[PDB]
């Protein structure tokens, strides 16, 4: 296995800014899709183990 990593796409792109969060919603599912992808990796570490 490898270290499970969770990133919050919004906290990384937009550190505590409402303005940046409102602009980030103009992209839509891009932020959620990248958390879905890292969750699929994090879960299959426990599967591999």
């Amino acid at each position: 296995s490898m270290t499970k990593t969770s990133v919050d796409c919004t906290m990384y792109i937009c550190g505590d800014s409402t303005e940046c969060s409102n602009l980030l919603l103009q992209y839509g599912s891009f932020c959620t899709q990248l958390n879905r992808a890292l969750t699929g990796i994090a879960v299959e570490q426990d599967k591999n183990t």
């Binding site: 969770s6 919050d8 906290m11 550190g15 505590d16």
Partner: protein, 40 residues
């Protein structure tokens, strides 16, 4: 002064499945349980 960003983490919810029950448990990931009593 050191500046540390305020406590944050992923939050996971644990459920029996809803048909079985409306109870849930919340896992505040990477948070010490002194920080949530200090903290919609």
């Amino acid at each position: 002064l050191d500046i540390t960003p305020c406590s944050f983490g992923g939050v996971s919810v644990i459920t029996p499945g809803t048909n079985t029950s409306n109870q849930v448990a919340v896992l505040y990931q990477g948070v010490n349980c002194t920080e949530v009593p200090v903290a919609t």
